[PDB]
Design a binder for these strands. Structure first.
Lengths: 475, 53
DNA sequence: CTGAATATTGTCGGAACCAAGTCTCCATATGGAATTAATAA
DNA sequence: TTATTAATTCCATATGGAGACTTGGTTCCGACAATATTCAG
């Protein structure tokens, strides 16, 4: 670790004589400028707002804010008072709500390292409330200047005055009033104020433009299968809502081969009767599967030494392996070569939540390193003449592969719901001719490729802002 | 029958892994090494920079 | 009759946290893969 | 007779677990200020 040495005196600093390792790591002897909280920002005391009980207002927790300072408020009304959001209304009535004064820079107290600093810009509308866990810190040297000086830089020191204290990492306003902000940062940043705000505004306008057309990685897979099989999107999520499935004794045996009479099995059978009313392409998967393996999941150490191992997090809704291993093992099995992925395989996911079970992926990346897949995967070697593995993975990640594996997979612990070879072999998927396939794929491929192309531009301008701030504050 | 005074402390990696690779793995030393010339750690850093008395 | 009582309210501080979200590593039969004594022949 | 499956024991796979781990931020007790009252000689 570190062999830091300090001298009693030091712990004299700050009105709590504290001597935890982090604070004393942040102290250091200083020779340069000091400043204080005086010639900069100013803490604002909290207050109870006058909520109007006639219109839908907004509210914002700490989880509703992101590391990029983008609040995602929820809309409450005081005419609903539903027991699902009753906690929010109760904490509002308690007095855990305030309203920023259009120019302050709210800072989260709990765990301040996750950049929850947000800006309430001057020229704006649709006033949003906030939790007392946020610190109104309204500045005197222009909000944007202090916001950008706090987000990227002045972060190794706001995070070094947190109270660990047998639990939550937490920031306190009193400690926040003690940081030793250098002047060269603010001096240089205000010196270039007239153009820094301009080009940063241009960059964030481009980011907003990219975000305006950004689409989720699952809806794309959800729409093409919905727009190609001519199934309306507003009934299979409305038929899945009603829960009064009624079956007879005779229907239990039909295609069961294990006599399973759970409720979810019967609802799966009901939904299958709806997803295939007009589609005439369904063929049993059992006759298109040639083998099935599981994998090898030894004990693993995170960021250790040995052969890397994949996890369930590496399977995404696009049928492409993430191939970004984290765990690494050092055990042997005398047959390790049987589980070293290799390009071209199809990996369905066995073991996950009731909604993330069955997600398949094709290893489309060329890797010269041997990477083991766990017992939580199932490798499918299908005939590459009728199924087109990528299409099968996309189908498994589609609502076809969700409304089935959500209701057929087994286990008493529905937090680690697992599938088995029986459900794979007894799966009546719709397989259209090879002409129809490679059209759903390809369309989905280009749409997701475009969505990924505008996913690094966002984290290119969001990095350009940071590097520009760093360069200007260092010149 | 003992160690060697030339190295004394095991700051030379040497064949420590050979004391856990096999057979000699059954005769390994599961005891905390106490150093007095180099540290590479914290425990033998405390035993040098602290003046208990 | 001045008093700073006590007696509550209502609100900062703080939690050997722990509610949400979601990834796992390991026992254990099995079943098949080896026999066997069978089994006709 | 030379087979014989139908009986066996022996390991690699497969299924399942009164689950277990992990990132992150929420409820809520409990002091405690500010009441919050004074009576009381």
């Amino acid at each position: 670790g570190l062999i830091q040495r300090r001298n009693f005196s030091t712990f004299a600093s700050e009105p709590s004589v504290r001597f935890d390792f982090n604070y004393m790591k942040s102290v250091t002897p200083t020779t340069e400028e000091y400043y204080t909280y005086k010639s900069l920002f100013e803490v604002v005391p909290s207050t109870v707002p006058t909520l109007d009980e006639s219109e839908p207002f907004k509210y914002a927790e700490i989880g509703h804010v992101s590391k990029n300072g983008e609040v995602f408020p929820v809309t409450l009304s005081f005419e609903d008072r539903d027991e699902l959001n009753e906690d929010l209304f109760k904490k509002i009535e308690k007095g855990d709500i305030f309203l920023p004064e259009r120019g302050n820079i709210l800072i989260s107290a709990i765990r301040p390292y996750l950049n929850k600093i947000v800006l309430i810009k001057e020229d704006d509308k649709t006033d949003i409330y906030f939790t007392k866990a946020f610190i109104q810190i309204k500045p005197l040297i222009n909000s944007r200047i202090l916001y950008y000086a706090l987000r990227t830089i002045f972060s190794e020191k706001i995070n070094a005055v947190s109270r660990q204290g047998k639990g939550y990492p937490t920031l306190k306003e009193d400690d926040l009033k003690t940081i030793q902000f250098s002047k060269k940062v603010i001096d240089n940043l205000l010196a270039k104020e007239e153009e820094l705000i301009s080009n940063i505004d241009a960059l964030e306008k481009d980011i907003k433009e990219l975000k305006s057309i950004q689409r989720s990685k699952k809806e794309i897979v959800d729409e093409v299968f919905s727009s190609h099989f001519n199934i309306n999107m507003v009934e299979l999520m409305a038929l899945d809502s009603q829960r009064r499935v009624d079956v007879g004794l005779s229907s239990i045996s039909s295609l069961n081969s294990t006599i399973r009479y759970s409720y979810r099995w019967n609802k799966m059978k009901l939904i299958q009767k709806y997803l295939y009313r007009d589609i005439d392409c369904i063929e049993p998967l059992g006759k298109y599967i040639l083998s099935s393996n599981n994998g090898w999941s030894p004990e693993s150490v995170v960021g250790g030494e040995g052969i890397p191992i994949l996890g369930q997090e590496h399977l995404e809704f696009d049928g492409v392996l993430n191939v970004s291993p984290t765990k690494a093992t050092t055990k042997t099995k005398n047959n390790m070569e049987n589980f070293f992925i290799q390009e071209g395989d199809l990996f369905i996911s066995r073991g996950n939540t009731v909604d993330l079970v069955g997600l398949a992926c094709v290893v489309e990346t060329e890797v010269t390193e041997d990477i083991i897949y766990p017992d939580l995967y199932i490798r499918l070697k299908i005939d590459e003449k009728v199924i087109h593995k990528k299409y099968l993975a996309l189908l498994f990640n589609s609502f076809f592969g969700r409304l089935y594996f959500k209701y057929v997979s087994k286990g008493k612990n529905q937090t680690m719901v697992k599938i088995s070879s029986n459900e794979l072999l007894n799966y009546y998927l719709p397989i259209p001719p090879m002409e129809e396939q490679l059209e759903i794929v390809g369309k989905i491929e280009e749409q997701i490729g475009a969505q990924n192309e505008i996913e690094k531009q966002i984290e290119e301008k969001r990095n350009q802002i940071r590097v520009i701030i760093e360069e200007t504050a260092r010149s | 029958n003992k160690l060697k005074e030339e190295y004394s402390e095991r700051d030379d990696e040497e064949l420590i892994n050979h004391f856990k690779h096999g057979v000699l793995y059954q005769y390994r030393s599961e005891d905390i090494l106490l150093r007095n010339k180099t540290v590479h750690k914290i425990l033998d850093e405390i035993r040098q920079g602290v003046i208990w008395d």
